[PDB]
Each structure stands twice: as structure tokens, then as C-alpha cells.
């Protein structure tokens, strides 16, 4: 009649959640607080972890996810030098990379690949693959020609294609093509890490 273990998941609280949050933090998955409550922010970090590790993206830290946590799984970046934002489209993560070392792994969501209509024309919600650079930024909440909602602190890398904060960053590609991250992650990129004009943005 004793209860089985807790698998940390959204809504959980307790020491095991605290330990998970700290381990994520230690491994570089973006999370600000280890407080023992598995809320929205923790969800973003768990999803980033499961994505990175190639695991089913359910937010539930069961036996397989725990094994990967214990193994200390971190993705290997493609770049070798300098500051680079890498976006892994298959895994749906953004990597803040410096000198070939991942500094942070951030949950992301990119284009859904479906058609959409805008100012009377049909487009396809593809995120481009390639080697680009931040060329402009708008430091507040702004509208998009591509995206339907507003974008928080966009950093533009090819025409209207930007990395930005969003209210929803799901476990599948959900956008019209821009790359969404949490507002907190976007603030970190801007204000703590620094991602100035000219920063390489590599998508693959
Ligand atoms: Cl919650
Ligand atoms: Cl949280
Ligand atoms: Cl999945
Ligand atoms: Cl699992």
C-alpha cells in the first residue's frame, strides 16, 4: 500500500523536483530557480532536456529521463569558435554556444511547415536552414509580418525571421517560421549572455 515513486512532472512539488531543477541548472538547461515547484519555467527546461536527449517529450521524468539526467546529457554544438546561436530544428532547441562549448540549452519552437495566408498571399511556414547573423533587433513587444501574435524582444537573422520570446513554446514546431523561446530565456540572451548585432545564428 506504500505509494510508488514520484516521477517529477508539471504540478509536482518536493525534494525530487528541487533536485531535478538543480541538475538541469548545473547541466546548462535554462532555468532560473530551484525551488521545488514544477511550474511553467521548469517545464520549459524539462522539455529542452528531453528534446536534447532524444526522449519522448512528455515532461514526465521517468526512468529513462532520469538515466539521461544521471548521464549528464548535453548536446554537442557544431561551431568551434566564438559566440554562436545554434538552432537544432530536429530537436527543437536553441543552443547559446561560446568557443565550441554549450553555455545554455533553451527550449524552442520553429515553423510548422504548413501553409498560411497573409496580406492576401499563401506562404509556407518553413524556418530556413543555414548560416545567418543577427542584423536588427527590436527591444520590446512587436508585431510580425510572419507570425500572428506579437514577439518579445526579437532578434532578426533573415528578413522577418527572428528569435523571440513567446507565450507558448510547445514540444512540436508551432510557428509560421520564427524561432520562439520563453520571455525569460530571451531576456537572458539579451541582458546576461549578450547576443549583439552581428552574432552568428546557425540553423540545421
Ligand atoms: Cl503547475
Ligand atoms: Cl517552475
Ligand atoms: Cl516526442
Ligand atoms: Cl522517462
UniProtKB/TrEMBL annotation:
Gene Ontology process terms (BP): cell wall organization; peptidoglycan-protein cross-linking; regulation of cell shape
Active site positions, chain numbering: 164 (proton donor/acceptor), 178 (nucleophile)
Originating species: Xylanimonas cellulosilytica (strain DSM 15894 / JCM 12276 / CECT 5975 / KCTC 9989 / LMG 20990 / NBRC 107835 / XIL07)
Sorted UniProt keywords: Cell shape, Cell wall biogenesis/degradation, Peptidoglycan synthesis, Signal, Transferase
Biological or metabolic pathway of the protein: Cell wall biogenesis; peptidoglycan biosynthesis
Full protein: residues contained: 123 to 326 of 326
Keyword Amino-acid biosynthesis: no
Ranges of residues in domain L,D-TPase catalytic: 83-204
GO MF terms held by the record: peptidoglycan L,D-transpeptidase activity; transferase activity
Protein name (database record): ErfK/YbiS/YcfS/YnhG family protein
GO annotation, cellular component aspect: extracellular region
Amino acid at each position: 500500500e506504500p505509494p510508488a515513486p514520484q516521477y517529477p512532472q508539471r504540478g509536482s512539488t518536493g525534494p525530487e523536483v528541487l533536485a531535478l531543477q538543480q541538475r538541469l541548472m548545473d547541466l546548462g538547461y535554462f532555468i532560473l530557480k530551484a525551488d521545488g515547484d514544477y511550474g511553467w519555467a521548469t517545464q520549459q527546461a524539462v522539455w529542452a532536456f528531453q528534446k536534447a536527449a532524444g526522449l519522448y517529450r512528455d515532461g514526465v521524468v521517468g526512468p529513462q529521463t532520469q538515466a539521461a539526467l544521471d548521464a549528464g546529457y548535453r548536446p554537442t554544438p557544431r561551431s568551434s569558435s566564438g559566440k554562436v546561436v545554434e538552432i537544432d530544428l530536429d530537436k527543437q532547441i536553441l543552443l547559446a554556444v561560446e568557443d565550441g562549448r554549450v553555455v545554455r540549452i533553451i527550449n524552442a519552437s520553429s515553423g510548422n511547415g504548413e501553409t498560411y495566408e497573409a496580406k492576401g498571399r499563401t506562404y509556407r511556414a518553413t524556418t530556413p536552414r543555414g548560416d545567418f547573423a543577427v542584423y536588427m533587433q527590436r527591444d520590446g513587444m512587436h508585431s510580425s509580418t510572419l507570425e500572428l501574435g506579437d514577439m518579445w524582444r526579437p532578434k532578426y537573422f533573415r528578413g522577418g525571421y527572428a528569435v523571440h520570446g513567446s507565450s507558448s513554446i510547445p514540444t512540436y514546431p508551432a510557428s509560421h517560421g520564427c524561432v520562439r523561446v520563453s520571455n525569460a530565456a530571451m531576456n537572458w540572451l539579451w541582458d546576461s549572455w549578450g547576443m549583439p548585432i552581428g552574432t552568428r545564428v546557425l540553423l540545421y
